[PDB]
Amino acid sequence: DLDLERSNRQVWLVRLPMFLAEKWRLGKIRINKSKITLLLNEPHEYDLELTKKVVENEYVFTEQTIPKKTAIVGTVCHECQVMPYHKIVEQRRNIVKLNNKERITTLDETVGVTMSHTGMSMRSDNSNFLKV
Amino acid sequence: ASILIGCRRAEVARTFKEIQSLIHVKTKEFGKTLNIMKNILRGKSQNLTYIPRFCSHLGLPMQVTTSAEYTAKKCKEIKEIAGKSPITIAVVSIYLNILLFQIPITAAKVGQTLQVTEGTIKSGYKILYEHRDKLVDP
DNA sequence: GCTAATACCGTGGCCGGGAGTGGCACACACCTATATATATGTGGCTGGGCCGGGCA
DNA sequence: TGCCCGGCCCAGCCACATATATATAGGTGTGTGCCACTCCCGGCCACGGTATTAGC
């Protein structure tokens, strides 16, 4: 019983930066008449570019052979993209290029203990696994 | 039993609880098969080596190893108790030679590492402490 | 120079028979349980003594 | 500042393995062989496609 609710609704698609997007996982957009920005809550303001002006054949639907409950939302109205104290963001972007992994740990003991635990050590059982 | 025989022929020392820890042979039938196998070998015609192995299990210096060697030989010459299997003589010998120095392991750690009873190493440490007189090398 | 006809080869599914596998029977071999001295050992309970903590 | 209660540790003690013989006996497990059931393999039957030769 799929039913189109309206589709008359106009939605704008946004390609956000990763820290603010993962933070969204509220602000106030200021539309300047051909340049629009965004005043977030304390914090930065963001210019959003008119990425694609004409954006037809693109729509938005939601879901509530196996038919399921399908509802239609609205048409896509404009393709957009948020563009960006920027030195701290640039330093964080330089800082993300410092990921490393831990190296192999060298056991420093007297060897004879570990080598005793290798072969026969007069210690059996102590763990239930495939014991039937 | 063939592995144990090949161990006794090559002057190597492996305790029954070691091969028993490797293979579950139920001990008794292992002893009978080892006995009749020894009879087969006789028909087709030494605890000192255990000391460096357990000293390797504990990570002890060479002076404690040769000290437990002289202690093992002397204790083999003094008689009294004679042995009660050589494993306990080895562990109480290393126990005395390590209580002579300052490297601390106590009785619980050496009893859970070498799989020996604490009451047995203390029972042997009593009479061993009684024979402490003639066991000094230097 | 152009047209028409005939034969042979290869795959897939099903059924039957054999074979294998499982079960049953029989025989043989193991494998338990009890007493005796010996020692010596090891692991788990029993009783007594000592130590630690809290409240008025 | 003093008194009472509970828990833990140490010293110890009992039971079961190791080795010796022997009888009892009576049980259990394992192996082999045969026969029956299931699975696999082989055999049979059906259907479709491609190439070559001869005559007027």
Closest residue by Cα to residue B114 from A129, A57, A110, A123: A123
Dist CA B67 CA B101 (whole Å):
11
Give the residue ranges with Cβ < 7 A from strand C: B 29, 81-85, 87-88, 115-117, 119-120, 123-124
Taking contacts as CB-CB distances below 8 angstroms, the residues of chain A near B58 are 112-113
Q: Are B57 and A112 an interchain contact pair (Cβ–Cβ within 8 Å)?
A: yes
Dist CA A111 CA B59 (whole Å):
8
Q: Are B21 and A112 an interchain contact pair (Cβ–Cβ within 8 Å)?
A: no
3-state DSSP call for residue A5? strand
- How many CB pairs below 8 Å do chains A and B form together? 32
Q: CB of A28 within 8 A of CB of A48?
A: no
Dist CA B121 CA B119 (whole Å):
6
| SS3 assignment for B62-119 | HHHHHHHHHHHHHHHHHCCCCCCCHHHHHHHHHHHHHHHCCCCCHHHHHHHHCCCCHH
- End-to-end CA distance of chain B: give it in Å, rounded: 41
Which residues span the domain enclosing B93? 49-130
- Pairing verdict, β A47-52 and A3-13: unpaired
Dist CA B6 CA B29 (whole Å):
19
A112 touches chain B (CB under 8 A): yes
Q: Could you say which of B17, B56, B58 has the minimum Cβ distance to residue A122?
A: B17
Distance of CA A74 to the CA centre of its chain: 24
- List the CATH number of the domain containing B106: 1.10.472.10
Beta-strand ranges (E) seen in chain A are 3-13, 28-32, 35-39, 47-52, 59-63, 70-83
Dist CA B65 CA B86 (whole Å):
16
Experimentally determined by: cryo-EM
Q: Where are the alpha helices (DSSP H) in chain A?
A: 18-24, 86-95, 112-118
The 8-class DSSP code of residue A45 comes to: B
- End-to-end CA distance of chain A: give it in Å, rounded: 55
B116 beta partners? none
A81 beta partners? A49
Deposited resolution, Å: 5.1
Dist CA B40 CA B32 (whole Å):
12
Dist CA B34 CA B14 (whole Å):
14
B32 Cβ contacts chain D strand, under 7 Å: yes
